[PDB]
Amino acid sequence: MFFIKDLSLNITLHPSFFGPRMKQYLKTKLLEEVEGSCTGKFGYILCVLDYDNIDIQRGRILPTDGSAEFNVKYRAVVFKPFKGEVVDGTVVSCSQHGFEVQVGPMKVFVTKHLMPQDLTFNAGSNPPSYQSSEDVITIKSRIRVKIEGCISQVSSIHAIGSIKEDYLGAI
């Protein structure tokens, strides 16, 4: 589900910060761009694992301006969904079309027309809810979701979920 993977980043650094502790700033600007990034290939880069001993390596100077390029090898906590993965989380928003279940940093939407038939959307419910036999689905409700499709965006990945299958639904 969650991943520890090795990856790199190329940083262009102005001559101005060739000071005594550029090792500090290199690691600082690394975290500012890396921590919180989201790509279609790698996914949510959540946190940089193992600070210190991050081998910056001997970086080369650019041909024209005195700037430097550094290839930074590091470990990181990586996370992204798959079109068949089953996870569980907390619900947030709720509408006529379904609810949005949040799993970690990710927001997964489930559609009414992908849930069990015997589930109604209550109109005058506050907060808004879904009703069944004894089952109650509101904000704080814990729901296990099956990921059907994965859609990648700019700094976010979203998924279409389903609870029609058995052993899913609510906990």
Partner 1 sequence: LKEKAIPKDQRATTPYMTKYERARILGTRALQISMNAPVFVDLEGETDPLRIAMKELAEKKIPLVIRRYLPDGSFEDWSVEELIVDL
Partner 2 sequence: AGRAALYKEVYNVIASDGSYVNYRHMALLVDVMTTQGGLTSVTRHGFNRSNTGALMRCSFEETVEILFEAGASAELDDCRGVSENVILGQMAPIGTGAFDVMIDEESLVKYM
Partner 3 sequence: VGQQYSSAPLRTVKEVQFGLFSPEEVRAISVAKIRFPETMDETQTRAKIGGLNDPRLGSIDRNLKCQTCQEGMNECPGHFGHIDLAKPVFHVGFIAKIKKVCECVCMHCGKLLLDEHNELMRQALAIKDSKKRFAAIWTLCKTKMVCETDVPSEDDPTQLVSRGGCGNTQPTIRKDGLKLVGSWKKDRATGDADEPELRVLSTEEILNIFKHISVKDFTSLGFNEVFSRPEWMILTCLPVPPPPVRPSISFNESQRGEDDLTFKLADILKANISLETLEHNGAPHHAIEEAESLLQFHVATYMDNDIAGQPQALQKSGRPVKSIRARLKGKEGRIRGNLMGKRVDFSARTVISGDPNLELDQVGVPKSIAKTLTYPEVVTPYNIDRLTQLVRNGPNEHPGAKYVIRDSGDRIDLRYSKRAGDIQLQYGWKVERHIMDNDPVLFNRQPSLHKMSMMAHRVKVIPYSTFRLNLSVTSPYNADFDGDEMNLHVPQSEETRAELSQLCAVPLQIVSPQSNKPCMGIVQDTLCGIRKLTLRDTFIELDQVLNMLYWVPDWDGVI
By CB under 8 A, name the binding residues for partner 1: 14-16, 18-20, 58, 60-61, 65-66
Q: What is the CA 60 to chain-centroid distance, rounded?
A: 33
CA–CA dist 38, 161 (Å, integer): 20
Per-residue CA distances from 131 to 27, 58, 62, 134 (Å): 51, 62, 64, 8
16 vs 117, which CB is nearer to partner 1? 16
Separation CA 111–CA 162 (nearest Å):
7
What track of x and - describes contact with partner 3 for positions 57 through 96 (by CB under 8 A)?
-------xxx------------------------------
What amino acid occupies position 101?
Answer: V
Among 57, 58, 45, 62, CA closest to 7: 45
Q: Is the peptide bond before 128 cis (omega within 30 degrees of 0)?
A: no
Residues that bind partner 2 (CB under 8 A): 18, 20, 22-23, 56, 58-61, 63, 68
Q: Which C-beta is closer to partner 2: that of 22 or that of 49?
A: 22
Closest to partner 3 by CB, 12 vs 120, is 12
Cβ distance to partner 1 smaller for residue 15 or 116: 15
User: Of these partners, partner 2, partner 3, partner 1, none, which one is at the site of residue 96 (CB under 5 to 8 Å by kind)?
Assistant: none
What is the contact surface with partner 3 in residues (CB under 8 A)?
A: 10, 12, 16, 64-66
